Design a binder for this molecule. Structure first.
Ligand SMILES: [Mg+2]
Ligand SMILES: [Mg+2]
Ligand SMILES: [Mg+2]
Ligand SMILES: [Mg+2]
Ligand SMILES: [Mg+2]
Ligand SMILES: [Mg+2]
Lengths: 76, 76, 74, 76, 74, 76, 76, 76, 76, 74, 76, 74
């Protein structure tokens, strides 16, 4: 299934994901597409920050749901 | 601005709303688009049930935020 | 048999339940495991809120089905 | 990557860890370095006690984050 | 006598307690002042987690000693 | 005593601070060294954002602790 | 006089500047308002990247001209 | 010989490379070490972006030279 | 999308244009808004004079880019 | 007297000129200093392109006035 | 901040410099460290020879950038 | 004989030159092949800038030697 990530730049990127994929995987898929390191990504769906731990279905992210990307920059 | 209301069943409606619109209004806009009576709608954002009283901005629902729709159905 | 109750926030509890258990019982078993009063629980399956009245099998909740937990008010 | 674990007593251990390492692993790495049994360790990040279950990235522990060590010992 | 409980979040609460009060009592007094359920509280003094069983004087917590509050969530 | 602040660039500033100094003071000492206005600084220790109100010892920042400097950048 | 900077986030910030102010100054004024380190800022006007060296009038930036902010992230 | 690549986070990876290795190879060696897809990597030495085509010696990258890893993020 | 055309005299017109519009069209849209004959207009972007032939996207003129207007005035 | 010729790109040349010098002369003095052929130069003052014909004082270009240099085609 | 100046001969100097230092200053700092007269130094960054006039930040020389040293000597 | 000119930008041009050709000639041959005006070229061999005056053999530039091209802009 397909989901959408809208970034801080306003850009709307599409990802092929599986409900059993983790937030970590999605972060990783985003790096693979836009270059941002996963440690610097924060994903938001329905008014929560998502945990790298959990999966898309853990949060009820279904076919064509839209996620938000925020950036955290730290000297890591 | 646009928001998304997704049911747990995976159906997703898009709504044209104003930050100053109330939960009541959104419920009403949902009925106007999918037929569900507002008394049978429960809206959820950021893990909590929204009150018909308050407004979208009261809850920090912004451009392209996603809400969750849960339904009350008698004998359903 | 086992079922799963997931919150929208992504937390997931497992419960040991019987098909003949009621929604009331499941609510009660959830309180027994996570502390939430049953009056504050809303259970959701197949897109709709379940009635305390009915049973799991009344709704077709089988071995390893997933329910949703939403919270009322305080 | 490196992280720091500081006790409330002011002692500080440095650990070589991976974001995918679990709290269990970190506990285990601490024993390997200072002798404390993992069942006697409580790790704290961002104000709260971490679960042995979850991983460092589950909590957003990144390169050079600082964790807190508290000790649990019966009658100690 | 007065003691201080400092959370890892930087907040500092003051409590009116008696040397003969138990850790359980202090937990209970903290709930009464900040809302946190005692099952979610961990008190720390002199580097170690205190037992609900024991009392303040059992640990040598005197007038104006500082305890640490950590949170444990299920 | 000395503490370290890491910026978003990965650069490390060293600060001479006193445990009784406030977050406000440290922010102010950082501006004095790297130019960033205190209102724009987000200091993070052990996974939480520090409040200008509190002091270093309020947070358990000791000799040679490392603080992080964070920027959060959010969508349109 | 007033100028506008539109950022990568889509945000449009207003700056009080003098024609004799340098690009460095503007960068510095932006940090003072949004937190971004000047070394990470790239300013664009009329299809050129601006040099920290030159001034607003060097480029013909007048009252109410609009500049663009791009971000360059590097391990500096 | 050894070279150093610094990321946007400020983190430093070390690479065992040969002067006759191409930028493509180095990009590939970086993916193998930090996960970033080569198409998303922008390597900078001495102020210019390196082309996948050319080799390290084509650019005068010698024993212990430092390369930079850049991300450019642009407005809507 | 919107673009800005600024004269050297500091006057700034805003235009509603399409990336596929030609320089000729923009000139024509400028006449329609400020009266200047297209033969008396010289458009400049990124330091070079634009050709009536080419289009906005041919030159990479995007949403909110700024063009420069220079004028030809006989005996003026 | 001195005048300044600035490109839109922010580069700025200084020229020693006389009020009675023509636009042609200034173009010619610019070539002599930066290499650009006069046929490729467009000089701009007070928002308009100057004519090779006229002089600096014809346009009111005085000590330390600033002109603009734009480039034609190649 | 630190920068590196490498000669084509493979010799490498490190310099402590400030972004506001001029090319003249850097030349002067090089003489102070290796003896070469500034009139005999040519500094190169991003493929081009730097002007004594401009500053490091004018060119976007940041923390740990690498410059190139060429030598100009009559009949040498 | 052939020589190589490598720019700092990583590009590598090949030139057909004669040992008796001057630095001026090589500059001129580079313009003829890549467009750069000779006044903007700096040639570097063995660590130092070459003089337009001298010849390739004056510097010991032989078959397949490599020169370096840097750019100087006014
Ligand atoms: Mg994980
Ligand atoms: Mg992670
Ligand atoms: Mg430390
Ligand atoms: Mg400067
Ligand atoms: Mg080096
Ligand atoms: Mg700068």
């Amino acid at each position: 299934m397909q989901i959408f990530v809208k970034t801080l730049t306003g850009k709307t990127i599409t990802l092929e994901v599986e409900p059993s994929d983790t937030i970590e995987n999605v972060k990783a898929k985003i790096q693979d597409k836009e270059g941002i390191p996963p440690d610097q990504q924060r994903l938001i769906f329905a008014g929560c920050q998502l945990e790298d731990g959990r999966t898309l279905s853990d949060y009820n992210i279904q076919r064509e749901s839209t996620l938000h990307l925020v950036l955290r920059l730290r000297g890591g």
